Design a protein around this ligand. Structure first.
Ligand SMILES: O=S(=O)(O)CCN1CCN(CCS(=O)(=O)O)CC1
Ligand SMILES: O=S(=O)(O)CCN1CCN(CCS(=O)(=O)O)CC1
Ligand SMILES: C[C@H](O)[C@H](O)C1=Nc2c(nc(N)[nH]c2=O)NC1
Ligand SMILES: C[C@H](O)[C@H](O)C1=Nc2c(nc(N)[nH]c2=O)NC1
Ligand SMILES: CCCC[C@H](N)C(=O)O
Ligand SMILES: CCCC[C@H](N)C(=O)O
Ligand SMILES: [Fe+3]
Ligand SMILES: [Fe+3]
Lengths: 390, 385
């Protein structure tokens, strides 16, 4: 475990401070162990300014050394802003700045269970693949076993039947494209590279294989880049109708088809962006919002109620439950579905119906506005980067 | 080999979809000239599916595509076909996604030593495919010397003669891309930096591409750049593009957002455009990206890559024998120009956003079967009607 900091500042072209500032930068770049990256870029807010980025890694939370770097800078005549990964609140929370920074997550995975010692070497084989994966790689393909493919077949066939009557129309619209273009079929588990390629061309979303569960912060921060972290292992042979883990069945049948819908793609990113630089408390509010929308969201189509939540679409059990009066439904409001508790090992007793993904996106944008944040942020699709705005 | 593409839509809940799918599966299995078939959600009509069929043939205007068409309409859809052809039987083909630029790699030194060294450097851009690292060149002592002679010479003219965008970005090239009179910067390094600035990318190029291919490349913010350097004895002016020209002339402007938008706009205009419109665009390209001037208050300065990389051109433009005009694409597009001497005539632009608008207005009349648009999120060409 390492703790990331980031220092930001600006300087005008033709400042006679620059030469001396470069000298200081060269010096720390060579003599500071914890400096990982120093970069300068055209400023994105003032035409005449340069922006400077320093990235540090420290092995301990809150290291005094960042203070020393700050003091030294603000003495070359520069005003420095510091972002840090910390449970403490001296600095605003750190975040990844460019899409390839998501590689910094590849080691941090949080999360028993169905103990069947045979699946074990798979998981390791499968999981090692994800910690080795880095941005720009093709996602490796997995020779799935007869057993696994058949688990997929059971889950797939039970699910595809309910989709017309239970799934929101974006799912039924996209799903046959997954068959035609991504090899979706009961007789074959689809490979993440193929799906990533399909999604990029639909909405610009893409996939990274993940070892397991990331922190809430890390996972939601990824969404801000339209990047979905997905697992490649499959649920145990005998849990087809409802599992705890997020197996590829949940990822491929639950999450993937909505991400090929533009509006949902935007709504999902909006949650991501909200998480960028968000406080820990707000990250928790957001993960609750994510649960009650992306994971177990309902939609209303005319007088009908149907499901878009990945947690619902991937479970033939939950598909039965939401359509009955055995659970209550409420309108989605982020300011409401935040102080709301939920079970994770049972069917949901309470769902939220979104009016549409466009309004959900707007509703989430306002939720974000309510967050104490030291700046605004904005996504740049051309540079695939986060731009900070004061 | 000549590429064709077949386009058509079909609404969700069609009677024909089932059958159509079977046929598509079959000709994919049973026609070798079929490179690719894919279907996408419609960017125009919500409940519709877009289909794309890519075909590749050895001879121009193959009769086999026409058979695919009729066979495809017996199954109940109206198809629009694009083609690489010197004829206008069909509208011109274009690459549709950035990886399709892969398809383009098919296309003063009497020194035998230099001709050898060119061959080597070249036998590498022909091997590059999208998604690769751009392989680095181990430049030569002499090559590194030539660069230094050109770099240091041009370094003293930039402050007084280049437009401000150049002076603004250059020290960032020095601080991030290793620009120096002492080493030649590598395209991979350059591409990464451009990407994080304006989303522009570099592909290495083996030689000269066609106008159409090269301009089509810009619609994806992809610049094709040579890696070889000019002969030792031609540092002041060479008629051919070399790496000094790419890196000292083209690269710095490509990091300016407004210029980057402007250049992409020219490429978008070129997507699917007729041969004679490609020609107009090509000339408009020459009088802006290559040899354009800008107005900065009382003075005229250079932003064209052809000028900025040639101390000889750089000295020329500021003199009174060289005529200066306000940039107007309807005036420029028709103007002849030399490619082996200094320019007798330059066009002066007010601002890259304006030049962008003008090019869009210019292009608006261009005849095409489809409305062309770029999606930055998906990095590809959306087609509309
Ligand atoms: O997925 S697609 O590529 O088809 C469309 C994605 N794109 C995302 C950004 N929104 C508006 C941004 S904002 O106006 O809310 O800032 C338009 C749609
Ligand atoms: O270069 S950067 O990636 O930094 C931002 C460039 N971005 C390109 C798209 N244009 C749309 C205006 S218009 O061309 O549609 O009028 C806004 C600026
Ligand atoms: C999103 C919310 O924070 C939720 O607790 C999380 N879900 C996921 C996660 N990690 C992965 N890989 N997939 C999830 O769905 N970590 C956090
Ligand atoms: C862009 C315009 O069509 C011009 O004739 C071309 N320039 C170039 C080209 N090819 C390369 N490699 N570099 C150029 O600058 N072919 C066409
Ligand atoms: C965390 C996602 C929940 C997945 C869902 N419970 C299923 O049965 O697939
Ligand atoms: C079109 C490229 C022209 C090259 C330029 N005349 C130079 O010497 O760099
Ligand atoms: Fe999930
Ligand atoms: Fe050029």
């Amino acid at each position: 475990q390492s703790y990331h900091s980031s220092i930001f500042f600006s300087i005008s072209k033709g400042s006679d401070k620059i030469g001396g500032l470069l000298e200081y930068l060269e010096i720390i770049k060579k003599h500071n162990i914890n400096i990982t990256r120093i970069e300068s870029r055209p400023s994105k807010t003032e035409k005449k300014d340069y922006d400077f980025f320093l990235d540090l890694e420290y092995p301990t939370e809150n290291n005094k050394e960042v203070e020393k770097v700050i003091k030294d800078l603000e003495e070359k005549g520069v005003k420095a802003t510091t972002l840090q990964e910390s449970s403490n609140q001296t600095y605003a929370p750190w975040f990844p700045r460019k899409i390839s920074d998501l590689d910094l997550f590849a080691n941090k995975v949080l999360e028993p269970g169905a103990s069947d010692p045979v699946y074990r070497e798979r998981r390791r084989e499968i999981a090692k693949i994800a910690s080795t994966y880095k941005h720009g790689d093709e996602i490796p393909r997995i020779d799935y076993t007869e057993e696994e493919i058949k688990t997929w077949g059971v889950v797939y066939n039970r699910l595809k039947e309910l989709f017309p009557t239970n799934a929101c129309h974006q799912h039924a619209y996209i799903f046959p494209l997954l068959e035609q273009n991504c090899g979706y079929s009961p007789d074959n588990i689809p490979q993440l590279q193929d799906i990533s390629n399909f999604l990029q061309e639909c909405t610009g979303w893409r996939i990274r294989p993940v070892q397991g569960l990331l922190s809430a912060r890390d996972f939601l921060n990824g969404l801000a880049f339209r990047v979905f972290h997905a697992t490649q292992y499959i649920r145990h042979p005998s849990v087809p109708l409802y599992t705890p883990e997020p197996d590829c069945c949940h990822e491929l049948l639950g999450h993937v088809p909505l991400l090929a819908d533009p509006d949902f793609a935007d709504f999902s990113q909006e949650i991501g962006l909200a998480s960028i630089g968000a406080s820990d408390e707000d990250i928790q509010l957001l993960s609750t919002c994510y649960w009650f929308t992306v994971e177990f969201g309902l939609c209303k189509e005319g007088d009908t109620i149907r499901a878009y939540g990945a947690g619902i679409l991937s479970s033939t059990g939950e598909m039965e439950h939401f359509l009955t009066d055995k659970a209550k439904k409420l309108p989605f409001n982020p300011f409401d579905a935040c102080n709301t508790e939920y079970p994770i090992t049972t069917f949901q007793p309470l769902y939220y119906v979104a009016e549409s993904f466009q309004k959900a996106k707007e509703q989430m944008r306002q939720f974000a506005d309510s967050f104490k944040k030291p700046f605004s942020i904005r996504y740049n699709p051309y540079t695939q980067s986060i731009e900070i705005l004061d």
